Amino acid sequence: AAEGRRLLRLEVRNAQTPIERKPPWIKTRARIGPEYTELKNLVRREGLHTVCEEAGCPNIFECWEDREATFLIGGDQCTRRCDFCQIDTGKPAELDRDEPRRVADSVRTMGLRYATVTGVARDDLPDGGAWLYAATVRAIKELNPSTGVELLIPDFNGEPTRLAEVFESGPEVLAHNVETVPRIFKRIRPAFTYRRSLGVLTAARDAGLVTKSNLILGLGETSDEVRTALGDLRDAGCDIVTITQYLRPSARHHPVERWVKPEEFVQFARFAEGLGFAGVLAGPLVRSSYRAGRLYEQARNSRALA
């Protein structure tokens, strides 16, 4: 495909920028443990995937030690390719219609009171995987009546009826991440658009859902553009936002253009609070699902409302 080869050129050029030294404030909070090994056995036992593993998240030992983990539904092959993401690009296997039950069963086994779920893009499917995402939320809630669900979705190309199907499943939080700013958006997430992704949040808000998004900093954006994007998110109706640092998965991935200082993240968090977000969490290794249940509770109690 012409698009894959277009990206190959960019990735080969990415690799001309040598891997960056990480600043000293970027460090791993934990080591392997019984809880990690047990969670990993379960995930493999149930033929599931986690984004924690597939996207190479550095918090995996910290989160899993706390029995917090985020499922990746739809397989481990994505039909899209974003220049920060190390999840495999490929042709997905057949739709596993039994996956929603197994996620739900795993949540029960884990005894989770809040479950976080994301997945890959499924452009191979007629409905782009809308049924899969909805059914996973439904399956979790059926098996786990008092468990909150946070669902981090692709955009389903912004198609209203695909979106409506997902929204109808009624997650406690609907997340969809704009990730970066309009000037460089195409260079980072070419299969999406800034405005389409904002429109997904607005659609979720209009459907009565609490909404969440994320920004990945260090991709070329300025802090002024970050402040504009936070305003855009808020105005679009986004309730909860995470503000985070890009880690480069490999030489073939986008270079790290800057390391945002911990004090700068504090300032971004304050700015977002000031704009009226119900929930804000900022920091270099903050991630969309990171401590999400605790963030949800905080949002659920805020004057802001959500």
Partner: peptide, 8 residues
């Protein structure tokens, strides 16, 4: 699985 590198 392959975890992104932090400071060395």
């Amino acid at each position: 699985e392959s975890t992104x590198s932090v400071s060395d």
